Amino acid sequence: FQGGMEFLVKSVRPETLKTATLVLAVGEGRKLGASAKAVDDATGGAISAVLKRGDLAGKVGQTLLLQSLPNLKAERVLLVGAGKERELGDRQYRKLASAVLSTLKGLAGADAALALGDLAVKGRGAHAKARLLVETLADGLYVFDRYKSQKAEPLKLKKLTLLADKADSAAVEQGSKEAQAIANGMALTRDLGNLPPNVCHPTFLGEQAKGLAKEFKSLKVEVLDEKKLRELGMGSFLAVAQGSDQPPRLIILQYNGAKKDQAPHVLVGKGITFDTGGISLKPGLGMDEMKFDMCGAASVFGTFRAVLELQLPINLVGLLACAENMPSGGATRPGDIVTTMSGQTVEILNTDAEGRLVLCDALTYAERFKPQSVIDIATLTGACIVALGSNTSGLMGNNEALVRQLLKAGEFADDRAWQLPLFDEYQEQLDSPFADIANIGGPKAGTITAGCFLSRFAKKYHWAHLDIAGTAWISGGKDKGATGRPVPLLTQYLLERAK
Amino acid sequence: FQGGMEFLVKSVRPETLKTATLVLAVGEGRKLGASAKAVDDATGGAISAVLKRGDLAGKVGQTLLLQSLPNLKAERVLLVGAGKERELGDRQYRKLASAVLSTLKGLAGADAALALGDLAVKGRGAHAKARLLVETLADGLYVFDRYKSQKAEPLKLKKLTLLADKADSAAVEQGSKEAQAIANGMALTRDLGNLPPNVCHPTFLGEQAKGLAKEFKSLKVEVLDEKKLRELGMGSFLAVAQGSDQPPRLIILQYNGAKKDQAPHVLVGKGITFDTGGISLKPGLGMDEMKFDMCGAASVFGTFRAVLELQLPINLVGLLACAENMPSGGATRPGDIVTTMSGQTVEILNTDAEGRLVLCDALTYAERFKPQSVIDIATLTGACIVALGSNTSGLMGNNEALVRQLLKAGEFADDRAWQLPLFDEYQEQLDSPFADIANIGGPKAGTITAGCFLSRFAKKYHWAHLDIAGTAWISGGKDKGATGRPVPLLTQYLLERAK
Amino acid sequence: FQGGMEFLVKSVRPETLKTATLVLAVGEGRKLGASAKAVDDATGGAISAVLKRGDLAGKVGQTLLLQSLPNLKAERVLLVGAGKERELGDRQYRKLASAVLSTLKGLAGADAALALGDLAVKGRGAHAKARLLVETLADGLYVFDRYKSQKAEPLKLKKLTLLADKADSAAVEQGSKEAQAIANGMALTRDLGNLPPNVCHPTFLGEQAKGLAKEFKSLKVEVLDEKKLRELGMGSFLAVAQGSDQPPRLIILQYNGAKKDQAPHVLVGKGITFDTGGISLKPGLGMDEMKFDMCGAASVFGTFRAVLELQLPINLVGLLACAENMPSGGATRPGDIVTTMSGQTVEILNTDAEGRLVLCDALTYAERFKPQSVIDIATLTGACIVALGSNTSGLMGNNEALVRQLLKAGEFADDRAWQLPLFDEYQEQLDSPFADIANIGGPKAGTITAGCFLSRFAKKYHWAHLDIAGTAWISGGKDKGATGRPVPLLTQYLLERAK
Amino acid sequence: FQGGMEFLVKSVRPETLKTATLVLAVGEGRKLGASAKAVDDATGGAISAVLKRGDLAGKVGQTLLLQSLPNLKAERVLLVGAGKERELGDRQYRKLASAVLSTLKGLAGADAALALGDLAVKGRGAHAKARLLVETLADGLYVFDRYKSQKAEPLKLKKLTLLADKADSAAVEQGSKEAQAIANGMALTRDLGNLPPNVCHPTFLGEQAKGLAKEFKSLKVEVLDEKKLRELGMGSFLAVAQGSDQPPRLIILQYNGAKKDQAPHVLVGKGITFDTGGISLKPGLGMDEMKFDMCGAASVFGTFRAVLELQLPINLVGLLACAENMPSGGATRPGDIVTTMSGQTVEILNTDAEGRLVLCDALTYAERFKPQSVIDIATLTGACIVALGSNTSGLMGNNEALVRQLLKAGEFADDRAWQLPLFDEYQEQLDSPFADIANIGGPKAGTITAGCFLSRFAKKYHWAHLDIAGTAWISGGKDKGATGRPVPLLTQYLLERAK
Ligand SMILES: [Mn+2]
Ligand SMILES: [Mn+2]
Ligand SMILES: [Mn+2]
Ligand SMILES: [Mn+2]
Ligand SMILES: [Mn+2]
Ligand SMILES: [Mn+2]
Ligand SMILES: [Mn+2]
Ligand SMILES: [Mn+2]
Ligand SMILES: [N+]
Ligand SMILES: [N+]
Ligand SMILES: [N+]
Ligand SMILES: [N+]
Ligand SMILES: [N+]
Ligand SMILES: [N+]
Ligand SMILES: [N+]
Ligand SMILES: [N+]
Ligand SMILES: [N+]
Ligand SMILES: [N+]
Ligand SMILES: [N+]
Ligand code: NA
């Protein structure tokens, strides 16, 4: 959006650091770890004297804010509860970080220093903790207000310092730098997802890609229009697009950070900038949330943004299949049969199963790059939400080594996915009496049969499919909006592939 | 519809009046009233002799038709029951009058004389009873047969005489003249509402206003097109119209019957020629009645027609926001954010809440006339039918004096409205995380939330809002069609303001 | 598809006929019939000996396939069970024929000889049986695979011989010749119905009619476009078409096989190439089956094709009213009022009752031919499926003799219809307060009131109406697709009218 | 629940008062008020020095918590923002009070003192501000946890002191005493509403009434079982109950606090302890919220509990009509006709319109008390939520003075209602061809026709009807549960009647 937050790692003593706010952890009910103890001592016991009064039980995320304490160079000391466990899990760690950030946002302090190195998080060393902490803090600063007449008061907080021991400082620094690049990527993804569909159409996304190439000389962009798509034979891509006044776009991103002889990784993103269902029209209730139907393509933008900042030694291709799905006098009809670019014919039984019809033509297009892996990302099926809910993405693929790599990256990022099977027995649900493939398989196993459909275009390479219909946005409440998932998972996968 | 039926007030004796039909009231179980007693005596008791056979019980609206009676100059005598009550209520008086017109319409009499001045109506004097009676009779003669190949046989009845004492004659005459103007306006409103949506589109309504100016030289008319609406920055209005092939129109009516120093009264009407719901498409059952979605604009035409006939000493402005809500490949999508003329940003969560989107821009435009009152009329919410039904109109406003003036006028006209609260606690339902206002507030308090939306565009003037979704038309049966409401309330309001 | 199967009638001894497969009937628990006995004796009881081992119970359609048997010139003998009754019904006869064909299809034999003359069929002589047997066999060979990349293996089976006694062969061969012409017409009807709606639009059907005229020089074709339809005043036909990008067509077919002084029979076909419902949009589930909403017109194609092959001495006219029904910003709205060719005005309460709106203008057009009968065929109401299911067509009409003729033809063809009454009491369900006719009559008696609507345009001639909404296609499963009904009923009607 | 928080009014100086937490208001960008300035002065400018740092913007409900300040006897000072307005609205005042309570709840302080006398609340003097403030604080302490295995930690906070000038202290004292009685009644109401329906059945409510009579010697209780209801002839009440295994109860409460010659006020409460809808079964989703269908009766409990605490000089009668609405083999069927106690026959078209069927027999029973007002309270129609939402109760009545008294009471209580009209034109929606009254009037004006039905049993006295379907509970979120409305309105009505 703008960003700006400076994240610094320092190895200095907390009790003499000049800062507007020093942040210390307090266990249930006091316990005081090493850093907090040293600060207490420096004040002559004022902190333990306050805690003894009992206002802070020490549960995860509780807070107690003190002003000037004797002999400290911190204008304020913020105590945050760390619970009673010796180690926190990932969810408690994030909750603790978010409670700290929420307090700091309301203060007029220009910086804060985090003396949180004494916290233990299950399975996480210094680098893995920094990645989680900094990503939560940086992504927590996200603001989208460009159509609000009354904008939010700018934050006074402009700097966050992570205190670490000198032996850990290099690991914390590296984790912080990667986390910032990921958060910057998610901010781009969230902006693209949150924009209204009358602004964020396929032509607009083409221009956004060209702008990203202006910012990053390492990025090459090409944008194909409908004439080029028809030349290439993308009959099912064009079938989705034809009902709309807005022309479709295929956006190609290319980054060559490795040797010319290294096979590229390809990211394929579903970019339906608004999904009405078409002639198979959706119900009205909640259909404004279909502006998030391009979050797949948005996450390819976000991942490129993070990789371009980090300058990873990999070769990366992004393919964004962008169209708007509208009803009209020239829209695709249920029962239409079209010829995909692969040559397979498809009977379009349901015009609201349109994401797989733009992706399948992009998966055929991807063959030309001779890729060592191909991952498509798409807000594809409501069935995935029934299967896995809103906090775990659906994952399928035709190569188990690649599926394993993506699961592992999702566990490290705390951006988790879960595999569903593409057993051959499911494929017959896509049989059509009239064409090579039907575009829907009926009410059983909807997420899997959608993956089975895509698999038929991905046989020439190692391929996986992330269904992010549940994880790409929040539906309601104060926090309705795009999430930026799965940029953390995708970037961590590429970070490992780059070693 | 031409009408052209003559209403006369006379003070002559009923029993020597030459007429095709003389109409007398007969009470239930009490003595003939003064007039009927005199006619009975004139005939030598022939009427009381017939009534003694017991065919006419005297219940409200029952009738007995007699041919020629001794010593009378009426070719026929129509007896109509008046009930047992000393005073009739408004509904009973209307029912009595409709029973009389029904019988007269089936007769070959060219004229009829009504001797009903002995009837008492609760809270109603001579002028008030005449307003109700003449309005009922004139509007009951309304006929719409434009698209019928077999048109109705013309009525022989062409003159109706109201017999009144010389002391009440002036008041009865003033009531008849005002009631006739109201019924003429109602006939224009009913015609415009009953017209098919393929004929009555926004361009047609602009040509009808130009015709009203050719008939009334005191009326000035300006019709603005989409290009001018864009110069004015009316984004909400243009968003509702973009999906249709039919161009939008803002019709401006201006009548100056008072001095240039008198601030104008502004009437703003919803002119949605047809409401399909848009991308948020409505179900098909009953969608034909969405041709009555321009009855608010039609009510402004009708009130102007009544005021132009009565030449009232007032300055009146009419703003008719006209558009057609249609599904298309260029139609507004749920989630679109638009900038209103006021600069306020609006997130259109539901394309079927488009009436408020054409009215908000019209209310902003109304500010230029420095109005002393601004009243919007719209078939806005079906929640108003759940709240107040089809007999009472919803009324909301930012000024208690204007709301009370409109409620008193509705009580005088027997075209009643009812106030619903615009408490500030309802406004939060229109909160959007992406814009200044959401166009919908949820399943609770729909009528109030629509008024709260319009209130954000009416803060610079005294404003009121009439929801006529349930009162502007009858859904089915043999009397399916436009009602002409709320022209009676609006003309009574303007008559009180002209004094 | 291309057909090609040769049907021959021969009167030779079954046991010396050289054939790839000789087909014999075996009764359940009764002795072999005359033909089967003679073949068994020719083998020395080989067939008796096999049947004694009990593998073939002889239930209708059971089979037992033998290779080479002593002293026969058939490479194979196929035994098919014929049940235990002395006569078969039409359903069992068809079952038997289909089981035989299914076995032959899977064999590598180039021909087969059917020694089935012994079978008896309730109420069917030699000609009636041959009509049923050959039509079932020929139509059973239909294949639609033009959008399958992997096409079916061509059959080895190219010739079928019917063995008949010399006394019967003349009737058998006439039944066979008629059955083949009917099957060829069905194949054309089935192809046109099975084509996807993005290919088979009204312009495509027009070109298909021109192609049929190049094939049969006796056929004259004229294709009218939108401009000519507007010249003719076809307002309700045009209202259906106006929402779509695809222009409408009225296709006129004329065949004069009789003297010029003899009045023609007219077939009027509903050619809605896809039915979305329009603004009154259908639900998405199963909407792909609306490509069959032109099977009415397709059956007129197929009837002409069979009549042209047979060169019947009749004068025959076909009118195919073709349009596509889509939602758009210019589509017809519920509540629109239009003027039909006939001058009657119609209120379009429901844009999904569109078939009768193109048919009524075609019925008026048909007056110019001064016909002696007019039959319209249409997939008109889902209510007919509720009434009569998927195996009996609904039949209505204004002439009792014509209705009787069609029922009798249906019984003979085993393609049955059933009459529903058009009692004048139903007509008032189509009363509109605004026009001469409403296009729908509510939820009661939906098939009948659609018939009553059409009857108002057919008063000048003898007319009947076939509602084939249930019989024109099979909805799901392996055999999903067009049926070709009612070509067999219609052709049998013309055959009888030609005598 | 237990309650028992001590509320005291004192007139001492805030700056020398010994307290665990002193609470002061801070304006947004205006000077500290008198109290707050006195305290700042006594600390030598410590509070103003902190505020200059800028952490507390001063918006309504923002907080800043300080520890020991120099020269104060307060262990802690809580600063709470009061906005920038000179006067607060009721909503802002409650929000401010709730933010203070939320902070105190989390502290270990045993008491707190509130120096908020400088706050102006629009339209409210000392007594009216105290009523609102103390009711918000006391009701905000409510806890319901009897089926949770993990109970909430008891609060340390046990005493709240309101600081007031000696000139206002008597009025603040009186408001505080009334507010705590109202809050105690709401706690009983909320407990009864929150109990699960397998515990809180009609018999249980009867025993609860007896327990209330043990606690308050002024209260007399009578509990009638199904035998007694039938002897009284309450066929409509019994019709609702018969489908359930739980027997019904009519509970009569009587309190005689005035001279025996004062006519009583009667409160009639709908106590449907669970509403399945019966044979007219409700949908499954959200049906758990039908345990709140006895909140009408619970509010009569709560109002008595407050009146008995205050010992008001009034005569008060309570009638709780309690039944459970279940489907079974003996349940009332749609179309049953029953004879009410009044003798009017009712045709039960919908067994889910059951509240009015138990209330109507209670309204007839109420005649024996010769009351000067009768008020029924019922979670009656979901249509009320459509008309007025979740924050305003619907109000209807046969006496304009009584209706105005209740509206005024609700405005003072900030527990508002809104009148809907019972025009005679609505009554005909209850016409039945088979009985004196139908129990439903169709989809229009559902709240009004329900009031119309009840009005037919209330003609012998001044009567009003509160529809609390939207205000009696909260549906979801953290705060799902009964609200205790309209106990504040009813108690304020009784307070004014007792002067
Ligand atoms: Mn979709
Ligand atoms: Mn989609
Ligand atoms: Mn609408
Ligand atoms: Mn509308
Ligand atoms: Mn249709
Ligand atoms: Mn159709
Ligand atoms: Mn109920
Ligand atoms: Mn209930
Ligand atoms: N402090
Ligand atoms: N955790
Ligand atoms: N693989
Ligand atoms: N990883
Ligand atoms: N996202
Ligand atoms: N309107
Ligand atoms: N059969
Ligand atoms: N022709
Ligand atoms: N026949
Ligand atoms: N029917
Ligand atoms: N009855
Ligand atoms: Na989707």
Numbering used by the authors:
A (entry chain A), B (entry chain F), C (entry chain C), D (entry chain B): 18 to 516
Publication text:
Intracellular leucine aminopeptidases (PepA) are metalloproteases from the family M17. These enzymes catalyze peptide bond cleavage, removing N-terminal residues from peptide and protein substrates, with consequences for protein homeostasis and quality control. Here, we dissected the catalytic and chemical mechanisms of PaPepA: a leucine aminopeptidase from Pseudomonas aeruginosa. Solved structures reveal the presence of a PaPepA hexamer, which displays high similarity with E. coli, bovine lens, and P. putida PepA hexamers (RMSD between 0.4 and 0.5 in comparison to PaPepA).
Mn2+ was pentacoordinated in unliganded enzyme and hexacoordinated when bound to bestatin, but distances from coordinating residues remained the same, showing little to no distortion in the metal binding site and coordinating residues brought upon by ligand binding. CheckmyMetal57 revealed that the metal binding sites for PaPepA are optimal for Mn2+. If the metal is replaced by Zn2+, a large RMSD of observed geometry angles (ligand–metal–ligand angles) compared to ideal geometry is seen, further arguing against Zn2+ as a viable metal. RMSD between apo and bestatin-bound PaPepA is 0.21 Å, and the RMSD between the apo structure and Mn2+ bound PaPepA is 0.21 Å. Analysis of tunnels and cavities in PaPepA using Caver34 revealed six possible tunnels leading to a central catalytic chamber, with three separate paths linking the protein active sites and metal binding centers to the protein surface. In our structures, tunnels contain a narrow portion closer to the active site (3.5 Å diameter on average at their narrowest part), therefore, excluding the possibility of an extensively folded peptide or protein acting as a substrate. Additionally, the location of tunnels highlights the presence of one viable path for peptide binding per PaPepA in the interface between two monomers. Manganese-dependent enzymes with binuclear binding sites, such as PaPepA, coordinate a water molecule between the two manganese atoms. Crystal structures depicting two metals in the active site and the difference in magnitude for KACT and KD values led us to hypothesize that metal occupancy in one site was not sufficient for activation. PaPepA also exists as a hexamer in solution, which was independently determined by dynamic light-scattering analysis.
